[model samples]
Target: QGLVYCAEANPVSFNPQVTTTGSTIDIIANQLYDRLISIDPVTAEFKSELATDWKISKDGKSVTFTLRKGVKFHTTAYFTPTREFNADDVIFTFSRLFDVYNPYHFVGDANYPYFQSVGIDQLIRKIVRVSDHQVRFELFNAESSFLANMATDFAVVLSKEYAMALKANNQENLFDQYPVGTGPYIYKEYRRDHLVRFYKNADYWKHEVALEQLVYDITPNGTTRIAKILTKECDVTAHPSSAQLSILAQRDDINVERETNLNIGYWAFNTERPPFDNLKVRQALVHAIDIEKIMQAVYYGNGLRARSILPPTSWAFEPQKNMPIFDPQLAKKLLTEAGYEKGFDMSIWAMPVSRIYNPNARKMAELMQSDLRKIGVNVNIVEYEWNTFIQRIGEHRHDSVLLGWAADTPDPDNFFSPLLSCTATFSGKNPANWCNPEFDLLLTKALDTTDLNLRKQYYDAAQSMIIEQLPLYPIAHGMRFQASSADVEGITLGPFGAISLANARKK
Candidate 1:
């Protein structure tokens, strides 16, 4: 009964480097590993984790970490004799990230796209091994958001022993079905759609979690998730239906904690195709929909209406109060002037159950279709399974697709560089092939700048251009709801909606 339950359409592999979407897998990965830095829930500051303390150079070009004195791995299947957490493990983890040999390495055809998108493979100048307890990172370009990126799942540390084994065996990844980390919990059992459980790591390097058992029961539908909460079958659910929110607020049987998330829901333009590839048509599409109407109807005043690529909640966003307001007549005029007086047909890729936006990706697609039809564009909706949906889009397989992005780290660069880079492959992780030399230079300057004002200036300029370009239209911001038993306390949802099982404990 204490098992934490979740409803997912199908199974997910919780490997961090492999897949970053899906709350189901993220729920597991959050428990299974520890990143170099952890994101502070309230302030969104980057806090030290594996390393006890760290320092950023005066130039902000490098960072030095002092490993904690006494630490150990969780379960030692890989460690013939696990080394007491030391400097070597830190170096080992980073080394393997780019190493061609390690299993955890993001290399070859399957996993290379992630490394490709972040430009991590390119910016890393060198890693100089400085003793077992210390290491120095030298970057090709100084980055203000580098530390924050490490707070992301990609930077979770790996055991040297297990990595070596994976390398020796020529294994691609050990994290797919079974992931290993020195976090607060360990993988225990799985029963497909019924339940997936995690047991507390008795030897977890840090404080043990309060909830001893973590269970995720696959209950794919929103209504079912609401029912599970009422029946006391699950302690937490991802996104409850809007109808269920009204009931939860009225009842005392559970606790419903909600926060407006930074992720944005949007309708994308292929940018490589006709009509949408034309700026006028794309701008026309943005204009046709009454975002104000959609926001109020779907969110009931609990959402954000945005016109820019950057969400207002994010730290780097500078409000573009002057951005074009919605005007259908203007949209029609632009469409006519752009030579596509008759809006062309475009294919929209979407799914039913969404981890990014609403429960209705397809419905949103339909709404956009009907709305755009008024302006002359006919939208075609194509539905697919979540995994397949992500896979196809990863390859830039759709003419127009419906997808939402949540910030992996609180840093503004998290969105600008990796997600929007034109070089990003069809990994579905970064579908936007957005690139501008001027923008890249501005981002570089921001990374090198030590002054807060200068950093904000660069971010503002970069995002302003993004709005002008219109790679993806902004829609509703993402949100997370927290529901737990009265007996369970001190658990709060994070800004990025990340979970830290290390600090949570039962009363």
Candidate 2:
């Protein structure tokens, strides 16, 4: 029997490193490949996958992994591996990202966004082949979250033999199109904006996938996906909008699995711009808005009020950190002090699509505009199609934009680094361009230390600084909900929203 899954968008490529979309990550990373280390969905603990054993230095600068032998790479139409996975394959994967001179380094306009966002490109000094089955990673400094980051879906290993053979044949870029991994599923065919098909890797080393075929039907509309699942056309569907959740839950044949995602929905200002460059102006803007109203009016109280970008579940989260008080009178006073008493006109860029973090960005923007109008701030809500919105934000053309991040990994650094780090400022990952040397220093110190209490102190300090500075006003964090047919047993969704089907079997 076959299983059909519905996804919100088509994957740009089969390579996880090149793209950062959750829909793409679910299909390529969670469903197909395995990382060196795996995380427990329930406990959030690190577990072994490709690497049977691993060791980290006391100083935390280096880590060594003993690869699992006899792990078979998928034998598919594109390429077949002559031998089992080894240290060479591990080296090939990291080298392509870390070593710029590597033959397979660049993937046409792709920036390896996630790695760059977390400063992995700068942290890793080198990858050493200790033996045929062992490899060591040397870091410039202690990286507390390095292992956790590696355990994420984006860090899956690829076959060096397949890449080398393709390179020899002058078909280097084909590796992205025809991915060869020691995964549970093999790439079959993809019709852009429609569907992608995968066949079970019959020779899978662990256990053969119960389902013979897995198909991802691209359905951008949540209502359409809901219809597909209700009609028994799709076995599983993800990211049902909040408005549709009650309807999905009302169905007897469907199961709605919900979990509070490690994410943040916030609006950012272009700090480099004239009016927002003033700290008082930013504070005024943050204080003028009412997040409680947004939660009630836009999210229908489905979200938790966010004081910081790091969600409460994160290890480094600081619950007692200072947050801006919602006081329009104080906002008006601050605006007057900043010489904007006459008020100013600014654009609020809202996202077009619905996401778990902010189900209705336009509605949120409207609410915010109404709140700002109370404090003499004339706001115009602007919007663009999804791709154009991202491009325009990356170009730093907008004065303010509403955006949110869904954590790709369980580590606290995953939340802090990608959204706030200096490395991410201009890389399209950090849209705020809100860079602070002291904030960056504290985060770096937190990452360099393995001590739990000390890491807590550093993160607490950083969180306090962010709150006081008001670089980005954190709006809310919400639960991620997905709907699937009741008989689709053993389905697991990660905190990052990737659906795992390793044990899933249709009843």
Candidate 3:
């Protein structure tokens, strides 16, 4: 029998390399592909996955990896692999993202947001294939989290033979549209907004895939997802709202799973726009909103109010009390000081998809709108389809965005660089388009040295600076909630990385 997992939305792409959307990562990352390394769930240490072994240079400028042999790529109808996983495959996978001149790099939209956002696009000098079994990554600078970065779902190994076959046939764009990788599951077919079907890979190298077939049942509404699980139409459902948990707990047929995710829900301003560019204006707008009220209506009791980007679960977490407090009077005073006594119209773009950090972004937006109205700001809530929402925000078409991030790694750099750095501005992931040389210097200093103590100090300072700048207003760090049938087993949750159904089964 197959398992039907109710996912929130359709994926931006089948390949994780070009996408950062949770919908893609949660549904496709683990099942269809594997990274070179992964963070161990219990020890939180780096562990080998596709790569059997790895060693970094003493100068920290390069990393060499030994590819695991006997691993086979997925056998799909469109293409078949006559070879096992190798260094050339690794070279091909990364080269497409790092090599601007690579044919596959210009195949589709061609922009690798995850690659560009984390500064790896600039840090990587070249990927050298040492041999059939080994590859070396020559970097322009030493990066402490380079391996950790590779451990993410976005850092996946694709089939070189598959890409070449498509190129020869003049069907290069079909590579991402139809993926081929060495993982636990094989791509069958997909119906837009209906369902995604996958078959277990019998030759999966790591372990025997427990589920024979995996189906992604795309149900975006929380209530609908809950009903599906209740009726046994869905074996499991992702990210049930705080309010829906009560109904789930009442049913003996359903089992609810929860984890403290390493993620954040934030309100990002388009700092390139005027008024927002003024520190006083940004400060005024943030102080106007009542966050606790939003928490009550939005997350219910399922979340903790976030003081900064890094959650309390993070080791580098620093408590921030200097953040703007809720004071409608103070907001008015600051508005007058900035010469905006008359509140102006502003748009707040809300995500139309469901996520752990914000299962009900619409409700959150409405609460924020009500709070801002008290401060005389006319709020217009804007929404679009999930994929279109991300594209529009990336284009800087919104005045402010109510989006957030689910950290792919434990390193604090996962939060700072991708969402704030100048490089990320061009990556389009940085909606704020904020670039402060001071903040970048601290981030650089933190990465230059591998000392844990020095890095913590640098990170602590950087967290404080983010509060002062107010590029975004930190909202809440919510718990990961998934509803499933009582018969389901082997579903485990972790602090970071994509959710996988590879080991999941229904008795």
Candidate 4:
């Protein structure tokens, strides 16, 4: 038995090679799609998954992997008679990542841009299958983040035959509705905005997957999910509101737990637009708001005030040095100099779902609108549902948008590269469209340096530049709360919001 739960937003894609943005979808995807390598949750160290062993090049320009044989996807219509998870699939997965024509490409994933920045995209001229179980990554230049990055969920292998069949039939995005992969769970059914189910993969090469079934109940409303869990309609929940937490904690029927989630919330500006394009103006916006008020009222003091774009727990998290304090007079002076003394009306695009922990995100946006009005920045608030929300930001339709991001990996490159690096762009991921060549160069340099102190130095410089540029006005770093029935055990709720169901069991 495994923990059953509800995800606020249903997963849009089941292909790990495409996207891992949605919290609930990733939970399901992680179980069904095993990566080439995996990161140890507690130690933050890299471990082999499908690949039994690997070696680095002498010049540090490439890596070769000796994959384990006999792995296979669960039997499905997508599987070819002779299909087995092999080196070709690994090569195919990485190739598709940078293939502009591939619908699965994730250009906005921080690693996507990082790959582009370091010239690895060209260096690894091609992925070669050396023998059946051997795969070689031929780099254009020495890539620093290759091994560490391979540990990211996005780098997992996909069944190329299945992918090709879907494309040939003009059903390119089939994974969202019906997924095929080589992992512990097999996709069973997905009812849009309703429920998702997965059955154990008898053919999975791993022996430790204890759970036989996995179910995800898609309940968009927080309160409804709380009620469901209370009545045992569901076995677990993620980020329940503080009010809901109090009730669940008091109930002996449920066990409540929390972790420091590596998520970031922000009021980001469309840098191409006015009022925000100016760095001083963006800083002014941060100065005007009393973050303390919002944290106390909206967040219930469950989060820490973010002085920088990176979350406080992030390795690169740095409090701005000699940063200007909130000064209404100075803010006004800067605005006057920027030729908007009287202030101009602008809009803040927010979605029903919050990137952080708040259940009622629109309320917080409304509060922000109210707070900004007092500082002479007139704000027009707008809200959207899940699909519309992704589309709006995907097309860069908003002048400013409120967003939250859970760190895909705990690296600082995950922070600087995706959130601000100039070359970073993804279809539904990066809305800010920030690109800075200098920033990109530094990030590449930092990743290549193995010295911890030197790497920290470069990261510090990047974080400083991010805050100084004010691409996004930093908000709060919230606590991650996961509620599960008392019968659930062995599952670890990670800071990045991932739940491993392999060891999870229901008593």
TM-scores of the candidates in the order shown: 0.90, 0.95, 0.98, 0.90
Q: Residue pairs in steric clash, candidate 4?
A: 107-425, 108-425, 108-426, 123-139, 123-140, 124-138, 124-139, 124-140, 422-435, 422-436
Instruction: Give a tens-digit lDDT track for model 3, residues 1-507.
Output: 789999988887889988888888998899899999998888887899988899999999989999998999999989889888999899989988878787798887788888888777678999898999999999999988788789989998999999999999999999998999998999999999899999999999999988889999998776888888888889998887778788888888788888888999999999999878888999999998888887888888788899887899887888787878999999989998899998888999998866878877898889889888887899999999888888899899988988888889998888888889888887788888798879988889888888888998999999898888889888889888888898999888877878988788878
Error of 4 at 404 (Å): 2.5
Taking all chains together, the TM-score of candidate 3 against the true structure is: 0.98
Q: What are the per-residue Cα lDDT tens digits for candidate 2 across 298-378? A: 787788888677788877787644577889999999999999998899999998777778888888989889999998889
- Give the per-residue lDDT of model 4 (tens digit) for 89-133: 787678765555555453223234334532345456667788788
Candidate 3 lDDT score relative to the true structure: 0.88
Candidate 1 wrongly placed segments (more than 4 Å)? 7-12, 22-25, 42-44, 76-81, 101-115, 166-176, 191-194, 356-359, 425-428, 485-487, 505-507
Total backbone clashes of candidate 1, pairs 3 or more residues apart or in separate chains: 12
Candidate 2: C-alpha RMSD to true structure equals 2.0
> Which candidate model has the greater TM-score, 2 or 4?
2
Candidates 2 and 3 compared by lDDT, better number:
3
Please give the lDDT score for candidate 2: 0.83
Superposed model 3: Cα runs more than 4 Å off = none
lDDT (C-alpha) at residue 230 in model 1: 79
How many Å off is the CA of 31 in candidate 4? 1.7
Evaluated with TM-score, which candidate comes out highest?
3
Better of 1 and 3 by TM-score: 3
Off by more than 4 A, model 4: 1-3, 77-81, 99-123, 164-177, 322-324, 357-360, 425-429
* Best candidate, lDDT: 3
Q: After superposition, how far is residue 478 of candidate 1 from its true place, in Å?
A: 3.4
